[PDB]
Amino acid sequence: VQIVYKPVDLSKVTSKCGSLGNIHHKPGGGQVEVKSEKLDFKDRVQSKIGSLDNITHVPGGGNKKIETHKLTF
Amino acid sequence: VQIVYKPVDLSKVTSKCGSLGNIHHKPGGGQVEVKSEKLDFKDRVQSKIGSLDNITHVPGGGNKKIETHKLTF
Amino acid sequence: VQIVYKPVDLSKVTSKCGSLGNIHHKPGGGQVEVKSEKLDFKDRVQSKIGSLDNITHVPGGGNKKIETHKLTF
Amino acid sequence: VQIVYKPVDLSKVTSKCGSLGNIHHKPGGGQVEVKSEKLDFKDRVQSKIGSLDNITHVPGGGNKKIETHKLTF
Amino acid sequence: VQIVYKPVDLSKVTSKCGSLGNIHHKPGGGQVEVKSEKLDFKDRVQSKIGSLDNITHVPGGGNKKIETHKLTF
Amino acid sequence: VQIVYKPVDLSKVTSKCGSLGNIHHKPGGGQVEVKSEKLDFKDRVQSKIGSLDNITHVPGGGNKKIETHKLTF
Amino acid sequence: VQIVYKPVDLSKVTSKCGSLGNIHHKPGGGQVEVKSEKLDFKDRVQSKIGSLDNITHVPGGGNKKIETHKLTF
Amino acid sequence: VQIVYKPVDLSKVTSKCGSLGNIHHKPGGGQVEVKSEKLDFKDRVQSKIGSLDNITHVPGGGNKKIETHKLTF
Amino acid sequence: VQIVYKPVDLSKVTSKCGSLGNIHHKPGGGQVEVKSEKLDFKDRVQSKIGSLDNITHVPGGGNKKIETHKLTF
Amino acid sequence: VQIVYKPVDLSKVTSKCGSLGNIHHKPGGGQVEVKSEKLDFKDRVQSKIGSLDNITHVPGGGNKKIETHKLTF
């Protein structure tokens, strides 16, 4: 049994920008009300209950490269 | 049994920007009310209850490269 | 049984920026009220209850490279 | 049984920036009220209850490189 | 049984910046009230209850490199 | 010329109440922006510009009685 | 010329109340921005610009009685 | 010319109350920004600019009685 | 010319109260910024600029009675 | 010319109260910034700039009675 694993990755990811601008984020405020009794969370549980998270995200260009290599016997 | 694992990664990730701008984040405030009785959280549990987290994130360009190599016998 | 593990990573991650700008973060304040009785948290539990964390994050460019190498017998 | 583990990492991470700017963080204050009875926290538990932590984080560029190498028999 | 562990890391992390700027952090004060009865914390527990920690963090560039090497028999 | 002015008003205005009840006023916050250049206000002029004044008014019963008696030549 | 002015007003204004109840006023905060250049206010002029004054007014019953008696030649 | 001015006002204004109750005033904070250049206020002029004055007014019953008696030639 | 001015006002203003109750005033703090250049205030002018004066006023019942008697030639 | 001015006012203003109750005033602190250049205030001018004066006023009942008697030729 001979296994040869030799993938090759030379692929570039490029982002270029002159300038972005005048970005304005101006939301009004709201209101949230939550009524519950019991919560039971088990094994890898994520949650957000009752929130007003306004988010401004302005990365000056960006990229994601996700890569997985897996061998199972 | 011969196993050869030799992947190669030479892929660059690049981000270039002149200038970003005049970014304004001006939200009004809100209100959140949460009523509960019992919480039971087990094994890798994350939560946010009752919050107003306004976030401004302006990285001057950015990148993420995620890589996994796994072999199981 | 011969196992050879020799992956190679020469991939650069680059971020370049002239200047960022005039970033303004001006939220109004809000109000949060939380009413509960009992919390029971076990084994790797993270939580935020009742908070107003406004966050300004302006890294002058940035990158993340995450890498894992695992072999199990 | 012959196991050879020799991964190689020569991948640089670089961040360059001229200047950042005039960053202003000016939130209004809010109010938080939390009412509870009993908390029971066991084994690796982190929490924040009742807080207004405004955070300004302006690193002059930055990077994270996370790396794990694991072998289990 | 022959095990050879010889990973190599020559990957530099670099951050360069001309100047940062005129960073202003000016929050209004708020108010937090917490009412509870009993807390029971066991084995690696961290918490913050009732706080207003405004934080300004301006590192003149920075990096984190985290590395783990583990072998278990 | 004989002028006799003798009105006689012996009326009553009455308000009777057992109890009111629980009153809750919980608005979210908004945002107002006003842009102007030149204003000119003269002779008995009243004005309000840019206002978020929430008002809760709970008089425990009440009345207004207004009377004008005017005689002229 | 005989002028007789003799109005007789013996009225009553009455307010009676057992009790009011619990009153709660909990608004979120907002934000107001006003931009102007030149103002000109003359002769009996009243004004308010840029205001977030929340008012809670709970008189334990109340009344207003206004009377004007004017006679002129 | 015979002028007789003899109004007789023996009215009553009354307020009676058992008790009021619990009153809570809990607003969040806001933010106000005012930009102007030249102001000009003359002759009996009243003004307020840039105000967050929250007012709680709880008189234990109250009344206003206003009377004007004017006679002129 | 015979002028007789003899008004007779023997009215009463009364306020009676058992008790008020618990009063709570708990506002969050805000922020006010005012930018101006030249001001000009003349002849009976009253003004307030940049104010966060919270006022709690709890008179144990109260009244105002205002009277004007004016006679002119 | 016979002028007789003899008004007779024997009114009463009364306030009666058992007890008030517990009064709590707990505001958060704010922040005020005022920028100006040239001011000019003349002839009966009253002003307040940049003020955080919280006021708690609890008179144990109270009244104001204001009277003006004016006669002129």
Short mmCIF file of N, CA, C and O in Angstrom, two decimals, chain I residues 3-69:
data_model
loop_
_atom_site.label_atom_id
_atom_site.label_comp_id
_atom_site.label_asym_id
_atom_site.label_seq_id
_atom_site.Cartn_x
_atom_site.Cartn_y
_atom_site.Cartn_z
N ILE I 3 -63.08 107.61 42.19
CA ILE I 3 -62.67 106.25 41.91
C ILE I 3 -62.53 105.43 43.17
O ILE I 3 -61.69 105.73 44.02
N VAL I 4 -63.31 104.37 43.27
CA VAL I 4 -63.24 103.53 44.44
C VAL I 4 -62.81 102.12 44.09
O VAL I 4 -63.53 101.40 43.41
N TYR I 5 -61.66 101.72 44.59
CA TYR I 5 -61.13 100.40 44.32
C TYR I 5 -61.03 99.62 45.61
O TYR I 5 -60.15 99.87 46.44
N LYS I 6 -61.94 98.68 45.81
CA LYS I 6 -61.94 97.93 47.06
C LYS I 6 -62.33 96.48 46.90
O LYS I 6 -63.32 96.07 47.49
N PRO I 7 -61.61 95.69 46.11
CA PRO I 7 -61.88 94.29 45.91
C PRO I 7 -61.61 93.59 47.21
O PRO I 7 -60.72 94.03 47.95
N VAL I 8 -62.36 92.55 47.50
CA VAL I 8 -62.12 91.80 48.72
C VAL I 8 -62.01 90.32 48.47
O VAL I 8 -63.04 89.65 48.38
N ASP I 9 -60.80 89.78 48.45
CA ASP I 9 -60.69 88.36 48.15
C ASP I 9 -60.21 87.51 49.34
O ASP I 9 -59.04 87.52 49.71
N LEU I 10 -61.12 86.73 49.91
CA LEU I 10 -60.85 85.90 51.10
C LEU I 10 -60.98 84.41 50.82
O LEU I 10 -61.56 83.65 51.60
N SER I 11 -60.44 84.02 49.70
CA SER I 11 -60.41 82.65 49.22
C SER I 11 -59.41 81.80 49.96
O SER I 11 -58.59 82.30 50.74
N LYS I 12 -59.50 80.50 49.76
CA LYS I 12 -58.47 79.66 50.36
C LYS I 12 -57.96 78.62 49.40
O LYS I 12 -58.72 78.08 48.60
N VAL I 13 -56.67 78.32 49.53
CA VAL I 13 -56.07 77.27 48.74
C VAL I 13 -55.50 76.23 49.69
O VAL I 13 -54.60 76.54 50.48
N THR I 14 -56.00 75.01 49.62
CA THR I 14 -55.59 73.99 50.57
C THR I 14 -55.17 72.67 49.97
O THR I 14 -55.81 72.14 49.05
N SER I 15 -54.10 72.12 50.53
CA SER I 15 -53.60 70.81 50.15
C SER I 15 -53.37 69.90 51.34
O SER I 15 -52.66 70.28 52.28
N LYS I 16 -54.02 68.74 51.33
CA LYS I 16 -53.92 67.77 52.41
C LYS I 16 -53.48 66.41 51.91
O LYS I 16 -54.12 65.82 51.03
N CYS I 17 -52.44 65.84 52.51
CA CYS I 17 -52.00 64.53 52.06
C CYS I 17 -51.53 63.63 53.18
O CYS I 17 -50.86 64.10 54.11
N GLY I 18 -51.89 62.36 53.13
CA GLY I 18 -51.46 61.42 54.14
C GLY I 18 -49.97 61.22 54.02
O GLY I 18 -49.20 61.79 54.81
N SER I 19 -49.56 60.46 53.02
CA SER I 19 -48.13 60.25 52.82
C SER I 19 -47.77 60.06 51.37
O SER I 19 -48.62 59.74 50.55
N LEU I 20 -46.52 60.24 50.99
CA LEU I 20 -46.32 60.13 49.56
C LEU I 20 -45.93 58.74 49.10
O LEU I 20 -46.67 58.14 48.32
N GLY I 21 -44.84 58.20 49.63
CA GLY I 21 -44.37 56.90 49.15
C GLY I 21 -42.90 56.99 48.81
O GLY I 21 -42.27 58.03 49.00
N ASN I 22 -42.31 55.90 48.35
CA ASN I 22 -40.91 55.96 48.07
C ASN I 22 -40.68 56.48 46.68
O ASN I 22 -41.32 56.03 45.73
N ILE I 23 -39.80 57.44 46.56
CA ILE I 23 -39.54 58.05 45.28
C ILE I 23 -38.11 57.82 44.88
O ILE I 23 -37.19 58.16 45.61
N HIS I 24 -37.91 57.27 43.71
CA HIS I 24 -36.59 56.98 43.23
C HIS I 24 -36.29 57.64 41.92
O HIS I 24 -37.01 57.48 40.94
N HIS I 25 -35.17 58.32 41.88
CA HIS I 25 -34.67 59.02 40.72
C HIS I 25 -33.27 58.52 40.42
O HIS I 25 -32.32 58.82 41.13
N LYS I 26 -33.15 57.75 39.36
CA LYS I 26 -31.92 57.10 38.95
C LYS I 26 -31.61 57.17 37.47
O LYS I 26 -31.67 56.14 36.81
N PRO I 27 -31.32 58.34 36.90
CA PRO I 27 -30.95 58.53 35.51
C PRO I 27 -29.51 58.11 35.23
O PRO I 27 -28.65 58.31 36.09
N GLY I 28 -29.23 57.70 34.00
CA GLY I 28 -27.85 57.47 33.56
C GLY I 28 -27.25 58.81 33.18
O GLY I 28 -27.99 59.79 33.05
N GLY I 29 -25.94 58.89 32.99
CA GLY I 29 -25.36 60.17 32.62
C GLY I 29 -25.26 60.29 31.11
O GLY I 29 -25.08 59.31 30.40
N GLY I 30 -25.33 61.50 30.61
CA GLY I 30 -25.19 61.69 29.18
C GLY I 30 -24.01 62.57 28.89
O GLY I 30 -23.15 62.79 29.75
N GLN I 31 -23.98 63.05 27.69
CA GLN I 31 -22.89 63.90 27.28
C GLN I 31 -23.34 65.00 26.37
O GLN I 31 -24.12 64.77 25.45
N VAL I 32 -22.89 66.21 26.64
CA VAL I 32 -23.27 67.36 25.83
C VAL I 32 -22.10 68.15 25.33
O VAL I 32 -21.24 68.55 26.10
N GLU I 33 -22.09 68.41 24.04
CA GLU I 33 -21.04 69.20 23.47
C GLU I 33 -21.58 70.38 22.72
O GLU I 33 -22.39 70.23 21.80
N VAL I 34 -21.14 71.57 23.09
CA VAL I 34 -21.61 72.77 22.44
C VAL I 34 -20.49 73.57 21.85
O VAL I 34 -19.54 73.92 22.54
N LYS I 35 -20.61 73.90 20.58
CA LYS I 35 -19.64 74.69 19.86
C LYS I 35 -20.29 75.93 19.28
O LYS I 35 -21.24 75.82 18.51
N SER I 36 -19.77 77.09 19.65
CA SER I 36 -20.28 78.39 19.23
C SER I 36 -19.12 79.34 19.03
O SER I 36 -17.98 78.96 19.27
N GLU I 37 -19.35 80.55 18.52
CA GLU I 37 -18.25 81.49 18.42
C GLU I 37 -18.55 82.80 19.12
O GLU I 37 -17.88 83.15 20.10
N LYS I 38 -19.57 83.51 18.66
CA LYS I 38 -19.86 84.82 19.22
C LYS I 38 -21.25 84.98 19.75
O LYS I 38 -22.22 84.78 19.02
N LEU I 39 -21.37 85.34 21.01
CA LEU I 39 -22.70 85.52 21.55
C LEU I 39 -22.92 86.99 21.90
O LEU I 39 -21.97 87.74 22.09
N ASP I 40 -24.18 87.41 21.92
CA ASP I 40 -24.55 88.79 22.23
C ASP I 40 -25.90 88.83 22.95
O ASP I 40 -26.92 88.52 22.34
N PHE I 41 -25.89 89.09 24.24
CA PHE I 41 -27.10 89.07 25.05
C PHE I 41 -27.36 90.43 25.69
O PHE I 41 -26.57 90.86 26.55
N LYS I 42 -28.44 91.12 25.34
CA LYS I 42 -28.66 92.42 25.97
C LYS I 42 -30.07 92.73 26.41
O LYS I 42 -31.04 92.46 25.71
N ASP I 43 -30.15 93.36 27.56
CA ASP I 43 -31.38 93.85 28.17
C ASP I 43 -32.40 92.79 28.59
O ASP I 43 -33.28 92.43 27.81
N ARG I 44 -32.31 92.31 29.83
CA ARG I 44 -33.26 91.33 30.35
C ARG I 44 -33.21 90.04 29.56
O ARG I 44 -34.15 89.72 28.83
N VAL I 45 -32.07 89.39 29.63
CA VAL I 45 -31.87 88.15 28.90
C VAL I 45 -31.39 87.06 29.83
O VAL I 45 -30.46 87.27 30.61
N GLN I 46 -32.03 85.90 29.76
CA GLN I 46 -31.68 84.77 30.61
C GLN I 46 -31.35 83.53 29.81
O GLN I 46 -32.17 83.09 29.00
N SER I 47 -30.20 82.91 30.06
CA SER I 47 -29.91 81.71 29.28
C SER I 47 -29.08 80.63 29.95
O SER I 47 -28.24 80.88 30.82
N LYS I 48 -29.29 79.41 29.48
CA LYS I 48 -28.56 78.24 29.92
C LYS I 48 -27.99 77.44 28.77
O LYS I 48 -28.73 77.02 27.88
N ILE I 49 -26.67 77.23 28.77
CA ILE I 49 -25.99 76.48 27.72
C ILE I 49 -25.16 75.30 28.24
O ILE I 49 -24.22 75.49 29.00
N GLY I 50 -25.45 74.09 27.78
CA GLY I 50 -24.65 72.95 28.24
C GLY I 50 -25.01 72.50 29.64
O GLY I 50 -24.23 72.70 30.58
N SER I 51 -26.20 71.94 29.83
CA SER I 51 -26.65 71.62 31.18
C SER I 51 -27.23 70.23 31.36
O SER I 51 -28.01 69.76 30.54
N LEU I 52 -26.76 69.55 32.41
CA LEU I 52 -27.18 68.21 32.85
C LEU I 52 -27.67 68.21 34.28
O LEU I 52 -27.34 67.33 35.06
N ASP I 53 -28.41 69.21 34.65
CA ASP I 53 -28.86 69.37 36.01
C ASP I 53 -30.14 68.60 36.27
O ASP I 53 -31.23 69.04 35.93
N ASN I 54 -30.03 67.44 36.90
CA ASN I 54 -31.22 66.67 37.13
C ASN I 54 -31.86 67.23 38.37
O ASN I 54 -31.15 67.57 39.32
N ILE I 55 -33.16 67.39 38.37
CA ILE I 55 -33.82 67.97 39.53
C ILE I 55 -34.89 67.10 40.12
O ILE I 55 -35.82 66.71 39.42
N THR I 56 -34.80 66.86 41.40
CA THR I 56 -35.84 66.13 42.09
C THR I 56 -36.51 67.11 43.01
O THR I 56 -35.85 67.66 43.89
N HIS I 57 -37.78 67.32 42.84
CA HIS I 57 -38.49 68.28 43.65
C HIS I 57 -39.71 67.64 44.25
O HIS I 57 -40.62 67.24 43.54
N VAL I 58 -39.71 67.50 45.56
CA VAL I 58 -40.81 66.83 46.22
C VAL I 58 -41.35 67.66 47.33
O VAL I 58 -41.00 67.41 48.47
N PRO I 59 -42.11 68.69 47.08
CA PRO I 59 -42.67 69.45 48.13
C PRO I 59 -43.75 68.61 48.73
O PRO I 59 -44.58 68.07 48.00
N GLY I 60 -43.89 68.66 50.04
CA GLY I 60 -44.93 67.95 50.79
C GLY I 60 -46.27 68.65 50.73
O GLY I 60 -46.88 68.97 51.74
N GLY I 61 -46.68 68.92 49.52
CA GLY I 61 -47.88 69.61 49.15
C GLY I 61 -47.51 71.04 48.96
O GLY I 61 -46.68 71.58 49.70
N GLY I 62 -48.16 71.71 48.03
CA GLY I 62 -47.83 73.10 47.88
C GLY I 62 -48.68 73.85 46.92
O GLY I 62 -49.38 73.28 46.08
N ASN I 63 -48.62 75.13 47.07
CA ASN I 63 -49.50 75.96 46.31
C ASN I 63 -48.90 77.28 45.93
O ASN I 63 -48.02 77.79 46.62
N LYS I 64 -49.42 77.85 44.87
CA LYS I 64 -49.01 79.18 44.50
C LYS I 64 -50.21 80.04 44.29
O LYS I 64 -51.14 79.66 43.58
N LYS I 65 -50.20 81.22 44.88
CA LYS I 65 -51.29 82.13 44.66
C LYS I 65 -50.71 83.46 44.26
O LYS I 65 -49.91 84.04 44.99
N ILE I 66 -51.07 83.91 43.09
CA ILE I 66 -50.47 85.13 42.57
C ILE I 66 -51.50 86.19 42.30
O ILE I 66 -52.45 85.93 41.57
N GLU I 67 -51.31 87.38 42.85
CA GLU I 67 -52.29 88.42 42.62
C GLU I 67 -51.71 89.76 42.22
O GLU I 67 -50.79 90.28 42.86
N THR I 68 -52.30 90.35 41.20
CA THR I 68 -51.87 91.68 40.77
C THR I 68 -52.99 92.67 40.82
O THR I 68 -54.06 92.46 40.26
N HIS I 69 -52.73 93.79 41.45
CA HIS I 69 -53.65 94.90 41.54
C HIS I 69 -53.00 96.14 40.96
O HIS I 69 -52.05 96.69 41.54
#
